Each structure stands twice: as C-alpha cells, then as structure tokens.
C-alpha cells in the first residue's frame, strides 16, 4: 500500500514501500482405463459408449 496522507508542515516526507512474492510448482496427474476391443468396439457400444 501507499503511505497514508499527511498534512503539510514544512517539508515533504519521502517514505518507502515494499513488495511481496509467492511461488508455486506444478503437478502432473492422470487416470487410465483398460478395455478390450471385442467387448464393445467391434460388437456394440452398449457400455463405455459415454466413455
């Protein structure tokens, strides 16, 4: 934040300011499922149709 406003008495005051910092590292996730071709892909998509 910027310094609070001040009444004038003689001379200005320079004051100071600060800054912050935050760091984050990524992660990798997955999920896999196994299905045999004949089950539905060659016969019919009765299940896993909405896979």
């Amino acid at each position: 934040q910027f310094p609070k406003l001040r009444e004038w008495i003689g001379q200005r005051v320079i004051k100071d300011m600060a800054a912050q910092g935050y760091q984050i590292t990524n992660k990798l996730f997955e999920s896999t499922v196994g299905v045999k071709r004949t089950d539905i892909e060659d016969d019919n998509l009765g299940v896993y149709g909405p896979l």
Binding site: D16, A18, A19, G21
Partner: protein, 50 residues
C-alpha cells in the same frame, strides 16, 4: 523492498542465446585419408589377381 526471488535474479533478467552453437568441432578430414565405397547388402568382398 521487493523480495530477492523477484529481483535481478529472475524478475529483472533477459535470456540470450549468443553462446549457442559457437564452439565448433574439428573439421572433417577422413576424406583426405580414406575413400568411400557404397554397399547394398550384409557385407562386401574384394578380390584381385596378382
């Protein structure tokens, strides 16, 4: 009073690639001492008469 991670180290720095592929390798010279012979199978056999 910014914290060091966001300083000249990382925040204020520009990446340059002037040093890339500048140190070369010794020039090829095998042609001056050797000759190239093509092949189209597992091996090659040479024969001369005498």
């Amino acid at each position: 009073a910014i914290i060091t991670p966001a300083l000249i180290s990382a925040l204020k720095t520009s990446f340059q690639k002037h040093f890339q592929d500048a140190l070369a390798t010794a020039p090829s010279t095998y042609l001056q001492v050797a000759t190239v012979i093509p092949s189209t199978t597992a091996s090659n056999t040479y024969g001369w008469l005498g």
